[PDB]
Chain length 292, copies 4
């Protein structure tokens, strides 16, 4: 069994005053809440039991939004991160939730999209030992954890926000772990930046030869809503795809149904109060149209 | 002396699920909350005393974001509209706030921008008798109150969301009134749509020969940010202007300073907590740069 | 070996006056000419010998832009389509070019993108019998050839621009054919719309049980620059991906180098004249950077 | 009084290659119509009917194919070649015969202006009969343009061309109005350090004589430059947003011609006919019966 975690807290200050009223992850991307996107990523990976970690103030907001998850065939739980003191804190806050299971962590403002994503997730998901992360070529690797490869394509180093990046491959905000992750996180000390760093957790696996680094090719989109510009671009990206296709991206209701976590009747009931708009009309359409 | 009202409620049904555990007029338009835009419009009209009317759920959210306005040299008050039963309800909810003063109403999701806008507003503000509204050419006039002109350019009729519009001129969501408006609203009955209609208020002034309809030229932008698509377009519009100019659109801090409602010391103190980002850095710059 | 055709002609009357000056397929999509995109698609399918068909006025302009292709390891040839009388005319105009070989046709204004695209292409291109086309879920199937599937997923009918589509699956503007296509096209007569239709070619194959319809999943982007709005959307889509990734979409120089059709020395020479710009700088970077 | 117009639509295309290998930047569409319609429309709105379009030797025939002699729009369009992009002031040398003994105006072919009361801002400048007039606009990146510095009283005191350390954030836009002194000023210029015959140097000549009028173009106007891939996209989106919202089109020369009475209703109807199967033609037709304020 693999349990999921969505880390959806974080500083806030960079995007104020936009984020003074609404935290990033509660800011919607085009037609649905930002959190739907990383949630749908965990769902597509086959994960149904998910811990949502947020700020003290947002945690109840997330509860109002998503509830216990039973509507979507999920088991959703909530915990608080008092201060954004590092991605790795997710494993300390989520220690009891994880128990003795495997796990996966996704960042609440990360938006993934592309063909054969289910396979990419599936292969990481099937690894019962070690950790798996994904490498994506970016313009600005200095903003991320950076993974360096040797001439043979083997991952050989990790550095967090390096002033002098060794490659243009960023480690994306999606991570799969075996049962070791909690104890690794328990042993970490704050970095210079003052954070309990996921890069340090991933490096612990790398130095034991237990880190799988999979390329996420250029045909995928991996976007982050970290800036005003990047939220706008992400919105435009989703809107172009949706309006071209007549399909919606990262609808949890759709994914639940396709995965047999909810049935047609359940789906019909979810669509009713959204009936007056495109999103409800869309869910109803799913009951009678085959989509490959 | 004119008091202002921002009517920022409305059914959110259309925009769900994007706006579920948050407020729709708190969504960013690019880089700042949507409500900053209409607020800035009233401020540019020389209005300091403003009543913000929203839903039971969202009114507290506005208060938390904007406070009493004193930081910006404003007097902000708040009131609740229990149910979205008409734009004209603003004048009933707002009756005691208005007192014996002139007034102006702007809708929370209306974004205006253009050259000489302060003159356009100044002109309506300086009419102490009757009402003033603005007509703007649109592609889909059936969505709005529509104003028909005679061959001489005189306004001759108003219809609310007509099936067969008599022109392509929509009445925008910005309205200036003398002391007759509360009494006119007091006497209204709900329409066939089942709403207490601002068009019926504007028609009451027109039937007495006391409605001024001013053309808002095609050089102005009048955007309505109340749909997912139109929110994205508005965001891009503001981003293009801001990044081209190195100026920000609709910063209340700037407008308050320019109007001498707050002094330099005050502006400096507002910028401090936003210092880490572009917005705080911008406010600081206004202290030592002349902008015409 | 399979030969390719890019049909890059067509009535421009729609996009006038924007295309009064230029053929639609010479307009840039963001940072490079539209024709680079379908050219790159053929290259990615392993096709090196390509006939570009355009109008009398433009064909020489395409020759000016692309030359004989030798610089990119290609064999580019040219032919004129006197009048835009149907997509199937490509096979009559290109009869001598195709000779006794397998072939592929791509429309000059079609932009495809997504993960594992080279696999989707290679599988169709490496078939040696029948015809292969791709079905993509769209909002507006009435604008395209539409494929209807039975309950088992088997394609059962094709209709060109039906007013009441039987599905939401459009046939995309990318077609792969065995040696039967020319004789099929020769027997066609103009449709009700006045055109020699590729849909009729594809039906001929379907009737013989020799049409392979492969799904192009929602993870792929299939865009059409046929309208002002859609060309703008496609530009933003490419811009977002490029700026995120620090990679460029559909650079023929890159693809030729990667396929080993040109070497490093040749790539370096192609970059030099573009060195003062981002595109040339990019081609240079590819010489010392490994991209997975 | 008549003013003659010049659109300088030449330039090194190297930057935008390969997008502009096929087409010159100034023929690329901004959303729905060719880039050059925009600065052409600016001149038209200023009351200028007689215009010289300057471009490279390769592009000159392309502009001539698109626009012709302008008679269909009530204009008198002429063409000339700039052999090499050796300075904006070259426009006055190349255009000397064309200008003759008249007032003149120069607009750059990739400059897009839009906003309320723009006709008034233009008419004020164009109706002056002395000196030069230019416009100052606040930008984020003044180092890309000519930059004007003001004193504490708002009077222009200096001009610098593409300064590494701008003295202000006010760029001089690519729209210039001149009296009959300009040709002789340009004739006396020598190339700058950038190796160009600079319009900034022409403008400084006027400033030194106290004959340069620098008018602020306020923040409510949009002044966009389509000279990069990103900027052309943003400009397209800007136009598309306004057009789709309004049901009106920006910088349609047929509309402006008709509104200025340079062509009549029958003429407009004929222009609409060949574009009728699209929205641009349908739009021209609509203008014959709808009053637009
Ligand atoms: C550092 C940190 C980030 N975050 C969130 C914000 C985004 O959803 C995500 C990315 O954060 P970042 O802005 O530091 O790159 O992780 C936390 O939730 N907690 C933390 O301690
Ligand atoms: C190799 C290569 C692929 N492509 C396109 C083909 C696809 O749409 C995508 C390949 O993505 P992938 O590596 O994730 O399968 O990139 C380029 O545009 N240029 C290239 O050089
Ligand atoms: C009808 C109504 C609208 N509104 C807000 C909703 C939008 O933000 C805007 C548009 O209203 P309308 O298009 O339904 O006339 O007005 C209220 O705040 N209260 C109301 O009673
Ligand atoms: C009259 C006219 C104006 N314009 C432009 C000029 C300004 O940018 C704008 C005029 O706006 P205004 O009517 O609000 O002053 O519209 C056109 O693009 N076409 C026209 O036919
Ligand atoms: C009908 C037709 C289209 N075309 C071109 C124009 C495009 O690249 C594409 C389809 O254009 P369309 O928007 O007119 O259907 O193929 C031709 O080259 N020849 C033709 O006979
Ligand atoms: C099945 C499904 C996939 N997706 C996303 C996941 C990947 O980003 C993408 C998969 O596309 P594919 O079918 O071409 O592999 O679509 C949804 O957004 N909703 C869904 O219901
Ligand atoms: C210098 C120069 C520029 N131009 C064009 C190029 C641009 O589109 C614009 C701005 O040029 P600039 O950025 O080099 O001052 O003017 C010419 O047509 N001829 C010239 O001699
Ligand atoms: C003074 C000021 C105006 N504006 C807006 C009001 C109008 O839409 C526009 C005025 O432009 P203008 O100076 O060209 O008349 O700018 C702000 O957004 N912030 C400000 O501080």
């Amino acid at each position: 069994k693999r349990k999921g975690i969505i880390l959806a807290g974080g500083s806030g200050t960079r995007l104020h005053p936009a984020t003074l009223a609404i935290s990033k992850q509660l800011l919607p991307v085009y037609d649905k809440p930002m959190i739907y996107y990383p949630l749908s990523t965990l769902m597509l990976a086959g994960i149904r039991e998910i811990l949502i970690i947020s700020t003290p103030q947002d945690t109840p907001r997330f509860q109002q939004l998503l509830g216990d998850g039973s509507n979507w065939g999920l088991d959703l739980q909530y915990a608080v991160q008092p201060s954004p003191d590092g991605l790795a804190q997710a494993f300390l806050i989520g220690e009891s939730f994880i128990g003795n299971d495997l796990s996966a962590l996704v960042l609440g403002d990360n938006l993934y999209y592309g063909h054969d994503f289910h396979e990419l997730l599936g292969s990481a998901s099937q690894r019962q030992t070690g950790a798996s992360v994904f490498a994506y070529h970016v313009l600005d690797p200095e903003r991320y954890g950076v993974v360096e490869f040797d001439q043979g394509g083997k991952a050989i180093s990790l550095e967090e926000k390096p002033l002098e990046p060794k490659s243009n491959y960023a480690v994306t905000g999606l991570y799969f772990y075996d049962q070791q992750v909690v104890d690794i996180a328990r042993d970490l000390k704050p970095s210079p930046r003052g954070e309990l760093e996921i890069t340090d957790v991933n490096r612990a696996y790398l130095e034991r030869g237990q880190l799988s680094v999979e390329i996420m090719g250029r045909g995928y989109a991996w976007l982050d809503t970290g800036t005003h510009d990047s939220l706008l671009e992400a919105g435009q990206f989703i809107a172009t795809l949706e309006n071209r296709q007549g399909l919606k991206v990262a609808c949890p209701e759709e994914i639940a149904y396709r995965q047999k976590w909810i049935d047609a009747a359940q789906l019909e009931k979810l669509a009713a109060p959204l009936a007056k708009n495109g999103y409800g009309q869309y869910l109803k359409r799913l009951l009678t149209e085959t989509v490959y």
